[PDB]
RNA sequence: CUCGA
């Protein structure tokens, strides 16, 4: 019973889901490795989201736009589903102008250089003959979840409508292990990590970011006193 | 400790924050410092942490029934807007977490902070001042969690196997750390019986004697034990040097340990030990698999057979009512006893059918929460429900809440449910009214003297003698004998005295008199304390909260009043009986008494009842007149037979109860004297509280009766 | 089906007893 | 023979009840000495006849109640009942 | 609070008032349930405070005759045969007959299956009786309960105590931003929402001509057009958000009496008092200790339990003795930075976010020269600011309020607006806050299972299922078998079966547990909606059978067992939990008992002019009352100085409280308490 | 009479108090609570109240 | 992402072979993520050497009592299991322990072949009765973690050889807890506390450094996938 | 008046 260095090999299921098998691991070790990766994936994977918006005809969330079926609050809730990635890592502005009739989707948004919309078919609003929607969208880049930044804390003036930003690009992470409990000289655990993302990044890119996160973090125990 | 919101602390410590904002030069003057706190400038959150440092606060939850309804804590700045309360003080506040609110009060002066730090701190008030038993103990999830790991499971994996064949003994680990590694890989179970070499736990005093005995076990010495890994982990929590306990940790077992820890080990050890029990209990309650599902609600297997047998007997009593052989008032009482016997057979059919692994049984049988009568209503049958009249309905709710009540079954159930909630408000009103009456009558009773020196006391029934021999422990030891102090040396058949006069009756010092054969002690009482205004400390005894002699100046009168008024919420005798006693009313029972000892002259008839007594010495016959609706109390006649129904020729003593009921305490005074009528009132009140599951020490009841007999009337000027 | 009178969503009822009179 | 007292439980409430006759007497002992320490910190810059300073070494930004409670534990004070 | 609370309030029956009875003149007999209340007044829905029994809710099918008595419908039994003929009977009319229970076994023709059936008789007698004796029978099982009581699924499995709290707390639900209809329902939610009057129903059949967030236009068949205007972000009586949203689209054929738009707590026309949450029944590190609740942070990130609240603030400019109060931006000794959110009139502008202490309306009142403090007149001289004879009386945001200004309403006597005599201007400012679920907010279910939020862990900390989906709420197990509310357990089971779906084995016939179930129930799709009518509905035999045939997930694996439990993983360590845990979906409601309102603290503030004691209530910025029982607790401890401190310098000592505040800001010691001003008043009253 | 007038029958106690012209010695828990004195119990009794604290002559260099 | 700086490691030395380590402050809630991972890495992934099987002369089919010594068979196995040993050879190594006459046996009375080292020569093993003799053979192997005795059944020859539990891991007991520490204004940041009790084969410092090296390599397998950005 | 423990 001696060491064999563990191996990690990737298996793909869809364009935004991949399974990762890591073997061989010590008995009882697979569950804790799968957790530490799931914990880091669901929280500390970099991504971009919309910080604040600005609709011309409105001054706060609690109002309506003429001709559109959804109120500003419901429009913002639909915009919370938007998935976006940015190369700038600095505040940058998206724009959206659409005249009714017809439906405004995420594809109707014109993103600046660096950022891009990953689901152009998401419903945003329904416009009739009298409906006109003109929206600015500030997109920053962070990680995890940050609530809407206050207007007293920011320099944003009255017209700006802050929104909650969900920066995490991973959607669902789980794991299972297969323990080799046959009473013999050789026992080992095989971890099967399952990662699903939101088309912003591929699953192996997310696991790589969690890999560099934990390599950097566990490197604190290696330095002596 | 307690967690209070940051926004609360800023306004609560506002002037102190303004003081430090102007000291550290975050603000120019105190005026702008106020504007900084009102505007909540980011510097105040760093400053506020310096301010609340070791500055205690007072937490309060109304109704403030006893003194533990307000306790002091160390504030800890927490985010959010809710107050974070410790799970162990939940019993003292009677605080559940279903929307309750508490008040916070900040002591300003140095004396006020010192009173909170020493007198009102939650860690310095673990015991109940009313009974002396702990309150900050594992109570709900914690007791179940500890009950989990301290369970011995036979077929559990990793168990011990005797050496047989070619393999030696299986399941003996060199170190508890090895047993931990075994359970980590998955070989050993935390609840499996094994043999472990222990090196940092004192063995039981039984086996410590045979291993060492001459010298106490030493930290480092080894010994073998036949416990489970969890039982070892449990014993690690209690302090080093405590005798190992290999029991299954029921709530009664944990309360007995903590009570012994409060008697022997100091306060700070008890507070830190129960914090360990809290953390460990919650950890293993999380992993104890305690869950409620429809599958875990097991229904009685003979549910149909049992109800059909009693539906048969109910149909026969209904047919015995169709022919007129049973009165209408008797048919209801006949069916009541049929369904009362039916609900007992369904409850017994559930106890044996339910396994001990089922979480619903593990919750009730571990002392966590709930009765088995709740589990019977849960899975078996609701039983006889009460209508707004009071008597039980001649038809029971046969369906269980797992099965589903019918429309009419639900409708008749709401009758007793609504009036049960309705009268609870009136019963609490009369309870709090009696409470504030007891407060004002004993508000000025303070311990002003150390010892009034009066050798007077009273005899306490330490134990009851058995006819065959040996002894039987009296049920009134906890409330009438423990925590007392002696006023007369206890003498057995030998000339040696077991316990000196003026010694606080501890737990072993009661077994010293128990094993000595003596069954009666004369103890100092607050009744006999001859002091001008207050009472002396030596006659009071052990302060139940402090576990030691009461300090001079402690308002024992208000503590006694709160101790009686706090449980008054739950009564039926009952609550009006308690008011009949404390107000010195001519009672409803109006039982007669023997004014003179002598011979009984029973002249009973049917039109009425008249009884005379020939005085045993001189005097003349004393004639009474009583209604035949009462019945004579079985008086302990001189024949030593306690069930001697009072017939003519019995030898009754002076002040002996004749017929059943409640003797007039006014007349008890003018017969036996103030000393005896005080004893009558004490244990008569104690009978009403004992008959409900409430243990109040006779000390507190005696403090009230001392104030009822402080005045005398004037016959001749 | 439950309450097929106004055009509401189709909620499926565990109903063994018919409703003779509507609310 | 106990774990290290953390926070407001230091000094231990058990050892403090040894240098004093009762719970109520320790309150007055600590409070009146805490007022002496507080008057020293507020009359250190002005005036003579300033009250006796802290007998033990104080911690940074330590409350005078905690300083007085430690020197009571350290047997550096007297009393008069 | 919600549409249900309004509908219940309109159907309330109160014994109190003129001509009725006084609260002091009402014994335990007027309040308890009477056998004549069957089908007329609800025996469950009633407050548990001092008004118990005195306030009842009218039963569902009940009605009032022109005499004043309450009639309830019954099915006339001719000769032991159930008839569809229905007649309303009064109370004494009901006593002149005997009626059979609603759930009686009945032949398809109408004859009773058993000769002896459970029958109610005069004076509250329940007994078996021949089938040829039944004169009438009940219409529906829920005939005896109120509308709110009829909305509790599996009500027959809950005791009357927790059932009362369940119906009383359903009226306390808060309208959320978005609303979800419950998976486990009773059918009553539809009619309760429509009859409440907070939705928008089409009067006449037609087609949708134009639909907007502002209004809906319907083109009728005859040719006329009726336009319904939506009530958007309107403040209710209790500060909740009344917001209507259109449902139909452009060109949708809609029948008469159909919901074309629904308001607060409504989803597709049904009462949506809460959300469907994934629940696990297990203790979790003590954070859910006796009735405490642990929540997933997903409910915060996705606004699941986020609600809109609106507060009304008001101030007026009057005519005073020395001039007239004027609303102006010019406020003495205030920077241009605080006044930055104000327009040229001194009013906060629409859309500006305001914290507590921010100025909403800038009003100044002229104060006389003879009313000045000696220090204030010196302070006025040492700053050279003449002509400041006015003081600040502006409308500021109260403590604990924060949100966006959504509307302003100005009324001016100058502009023909009729104000009360002596007023020159009136301004109302509407502030709306977006309240996410917070620690301590009071949640509750439909079975009287209530509790405050004890801890909101991160989504990764939550115990998650086999496929990584974390649970939303962790309910403690200990607070389940005490309260006798097994309905929450049965709702959790049926809640999961609705979430996943089921498929009964059709081969070899219909199984023996699903023989009573309708054919519509044999197959279900994920997220299906179901009804469990009160005293009818799902039985445990069918619920046990549904758990055995739960639909698999997208991967094809069945997460929950036939027992209803599932294997969970500890998100904090990674090791799976040692035993399976009951996991399903339960309908949780956000009650109007939030810490954002219920938190309060006070250093100093206003004092009652007469008694010189601190004010009462949070709105008046008052202090807590250290009552009579609390003083007994101080004396029992022997804490004399804390007691003297509470009753003197911290309360009604006029000079002591000021010198204490000075002693704190100076760093000095706390001075000696003086004489209470309240005791001075007592003596002057005895005189 | 001050401890009684705050308990029950306020008018009945105040009438007999002014007739008998009773003078109340303010030495009681309920009375001192009303007037604001230290209650004669616990830390309020004269044994613990009037107490002088002085440092032992052993003092540090500074 | 965003920078997360100032996480430090401090050590408090309780005993020479037991220390407490604090990782402070960590982001919420990384204290639990690397908490159970560091413990299981210490307890199960550090190479060490321990006894695999023993064989006692005079014990064939009984295993109940050894004549000539006070201790029975299982008591000998216990204090032999706690024998601390290190080896430079990966393959199994057989050692012999023999001593005659009344007296006491120790782990210093053993003769260690070249490459292996007995670190507790003063450990009591057995008490020798009058005219008592004890011969016993020990099997030492390298490994990691804890392996039960049942899996060592094949290592013993069919001649009175008994397998034993192998405590390969150099660390004995590791526990961890997570507290809270505020860096600036928020109090959500975690503080991890590690309590490791180890044998005298290596100090707790090197045991933690060994677990850190193996873990950086472990998550290095995932880091090598793309080398994307992430705040340090 | 209505509700919360
Ligand atoms: Zn005495």
PDB file of C-alpha atoms in Angstrom, chain A residues 38 172, chain E residues 180-184 274-282 284 288 293-299 302 304-305 443 446 449 453 455 457-459 461-476 488-489 491-500 527 547 550 553 559-561 564-569 581-589:
ATOM      1  CA  UNK A  38     -17.998  23.075  -4.499  1.00  0.00           C
ATOM      2  CA  UNK A 172     -25.062  24.071  -9.885  1.00  0.00           C
TER       3      UNK A 172
ATOM      4  CA  UNK E 180     -46.151  32.330  -6.332  1.00  0.00           C
ATOM      5  CA  UNK E 181     -49.284  30.233  -6.015  1.00  0.00           C
ATOM      6  CA  UNK E 182     -48.846  27.292  -3.609  1.00  0.00           C
ATOM      7  CA  UNK E 183     -48.217  23.821  -4.981  1.00  0.00           C
ATOM      8  CA  UNK E 184     -50.382  22.346  -2.208  1.00  0.00           C
ATOM      9  CA  UNK E 274     -46.221  33.125   0.331  1.00  0.00           C
ATOM     10  CA  UNK E 275     -43.691  31.060  -1.602  1.00  0.00           C
ATOM     11  CA  UNK E 276     -42.878  27.393  -2.158  1.00  0.00           C
ATOM     12  CA  UNK E 277     -39.637  26.665  -0.295  1.00  0.00           C
ATOM     13  CA  UNK E 278     -37.498  23.522  -0.222  1.00  0.00           C
ATOM     14  CA  UNK E 279     -37.581  22.422   3.425  1.00  0.00           C
ATOM     15  CA  UNK E 280     -35.519  19.900   5.396  1.00  0.00           C
ATOM     16  CA  UNK E 281     -36.695  18.707   8.823  1.00  0.00           C
ATOM     17  CA  UNK E 282     -33.531  18.446  10.912  1.00  0.00           C
ATOM     18  CA  UNK E 284     -28.736  22.228  12.345  1.00  0.00           C
ATOM     19  CA  UNK E 288     -32.965  26.487  14.650  1.00  0.00           C
ATOM     20  CA  UNK E 293     -35.585  29.236  11.380  1.00  0.00           C
ATOM     21  CA  UNK E 294     -32.520  28.918   9.139  1.00  0.00           C
ATOM     22  CA  UNK E 295     -32.775  30.352   5.627  1.00  0.00           C
ATOM     23  CA  UNK E 296     -30.792  29.987   2.428  1.00  0.00           C
ATOM     24  CA  UNK E 297     -29.160  33.186   1.207  1.00  0.00           C
ATOM     25  CA  UNK E 298     -30.737  32.393  -2.179  1.00  0.00           C
ATOM     26  CA  UNK E 299     -33.975  33.895  -0.837  1.00  0.00           C
ATOM     27  CA  UNK E 302     -33.302  36.238  -5.779  1.00  0.00           C
ATOM     28  CA  UNK E 304     -37.966  35.421  -2.988  1.00  0.00           C
ATOM     29  CA  UNK E 305     -39.055  36.907   0.356  1.00  0.00           C
ATOM     30  CA  UNK E 443     -42.041  33.675   8.960  1.00  0.00           C
ATOM     31  CA  UNK E 446     -50.500  27.631   7.277  1.00  0.00           C
ATOM     32  CA  UNK E 449     -45.973  26.875  12.744  1.00  0.00           C
ATOM     33  CA  UNK E 453     -35.214  33.961  11.151  1.00  0.00           C
ATOM     34  CA  UNK E 455     -29.564  32.601  10.741  1.00  0.00           C
ATOM     35  CA  UNK E 457     -26.306  30.896   5.955  1.00  0.00           C
ATOM     36  CA  UNK E 458     -24.545  31.158   2.583  1.00  0.00           C
ATOM     37  CA  UNK E 459     -25.930  28.956  -0.174  1.00  0.00           C
ATOM     38  CA  UNK E 461     -23.382  26.108   3.840  1.00  0.00           C
ATOM     39  CA  UNK E 462     -26.914  24.776   3.367  1.00  0.00           C
ATOM     40  CA  UNK E 463     -27.458  20.994   3.385  1.00  0.00           C
ATOM     41  CA  UNK E 464     -27.854  20.119  -0.285  1.00  0.00           C
ATOM     42  CA  UNK E 465     -29.451  17.123  -1.980  1.00  0.00           C
ATOM     43  CA  UNK E 466     -27.710  14.510  -4.122  1.00  0.00           C
ATOM     44  CA  UNK E 467     -27.758  16.686  -7.266  1.00  0.00           C
ATOM     45  CA  UNK E 468     -26.350  19.751  -5.489  1.00  0.00           C
ATOM     46  CA  UNK E 469     -29.612  21.687  -5.173  1.00  0.00           C
ATOM     47  CA  UNK E 470     -29.481  23.227  -1.674  1.00  0.00           C
ATOM     48  CA  UNK E 471     -32.519  23.415   0.559  1.00  0.00           C
ATOM     49  CA  UNK E 472     -34.107  26.808   1.171  1.00  0.00           C
ATOM     50  CA  UNK E 473     -35.222  26.466   4.805  1.00  0.00           C
ATOM     51  CA  UNK E 474     -34.219  24.210   7.709  1.00  0.00           C
ATOM     52  CA  UNK E 475     -37.081  23.562  10.133  1.00  0.00           C
ATOM     53  CA  UNK E 476     -36.392  22.115  13.566  1.00  0.00           C
ATOM     54  CA  UNK E 488     -47.107  20.529   7.812  1.00  0.00           C
ATOM     55  CA  UNK E 489     -45.482  17.097   7.500  1.00  0.00           C
ATOM     56  CA  UNK E 491     -47.918  19.153   3.156  1.00  0.00           C
ATOM     57  CA  UNK E 492     -44.161  18.600   2.872  1.00  0.00           C
ATOM     58  CA  UNK E 493     -44.727  15.140   1.381  1.00  0.00           C
ATOM     59  CA  UNK E 494     -47.425  16.235  -1.070  1.00  0.00           C
ATOM     60  CA  UNK E 495     -45.377  19.371  -1.723  1.00  0.00           C
ATOM     61  CA  UNK E 496     -42.488  17.318  -3.077  1.00  0.00           C
ATOM     62  CA  UNK E 497     -44.774  15.065  -5.130  1.00  0.00           C
ATOM     63  CA  UNK E 498     -46.146  18.210  -6.770  1.00  0.00           C
ATOM     64  CA  UNK E 499     -42.613  19.516  -7.345  1.00  0.00           C
ATOM     65  CA  UNK E 500     -41.400  16.278  -8.967  1.00  0.00           C
ATOM     66  CA  UNK E 527     -44.597  21.692 -10.566  1.00  0.00           C
ATOM     67  CA  UNK E 547     -44.066   8.896  -2.514  1.00  0.00           C
ATOM     68  CA  UNK E 550     -42.170  10.070  -7.478  1.00  0.00           C
ATOM     69  CA  UNK E 553     -34.964  14.268 -11.930  1.00  0.00           C
ATOM     70  CA  UNK E 559     -33.832  11.794  -4.704  1.00  0.00           C
ATOM     71  CA  UNK E 560     -36.454  11.077  -2.017  1.00  0.00           C
ATOM     72  CA  UNK E 561     -37.382   7.607  -0.789  1.00  0.00           C
ATOM     73  CA  UNK E 564     -40.315  10.677   2.070  1.00  0.00           C
ATOM     74  CA  UNK E 565     -36.765  11.149   3.361  1.00  0.00           C
ATOM     75  CA  UNK E 566     -33.688  11.923   1.278  1.00  0.00           C
ATOM     76  CA  UNK E 567     -29.925  11.819   1.751  1.00  0.00           C
ATOM     77  CA  UNK E 568     -28.378  15.234   2.423  1.00  0.00           C
ATOM     78  CA  UNK E 569     -24.789  16.485   2.455  1.00  0.00           C
ATOM     79  CA  UNK E 581     -34.066  13.458   6.329  1.00  0.00           C
ATOM     80  CA  UNK E 582     -37.627  14.384   5.374  1.00  0.00           C
ATOM     81  CA  UNK E 583     -37.304  16.837   2.478  1.00  0.00           C
ATOM     82  CA  UNK E 584     -40.038  18.498   0.464  1.00  0.00           C
ATOM     83  CA  UNK E 585     -41.715  21.781  -0.402  1.00  0.00           C
ATOM     84  CA  UNK E 586     -43.764  23.848   2.051  1.00  0.00           C
ATOM     85  CA  UNK E 587     -45.685  27.097   1.595  1.00  0.00           C
ATOM     86  CA  UNK E 588     -44.110  29.743   3.851  1.00  0.00           C
ATOM     87  CA  UNK E 589     -45.614  33.206   4.333  1.00  0.00           C
TER      88      UNK E 589
END
